[PDB]
Design a protein around this ligand. Structure first.
Ligand SMILES: [Zn+2]
Length: 25
């Protein structure tokens, strides 16, 4: 969902599964 991501480039990477690494719980 990359919705919880409160970043720009991070959330704007179209890679939730990839972003989840640096944006997990
Ligand atoms: Zn993120």
């Amino acid at each position: 969902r990359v919705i919880a991501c409160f970043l720009k480039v991070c959330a704007a990477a179209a890679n939730v599964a990839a972003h989840m690494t640096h944006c997990a719980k």
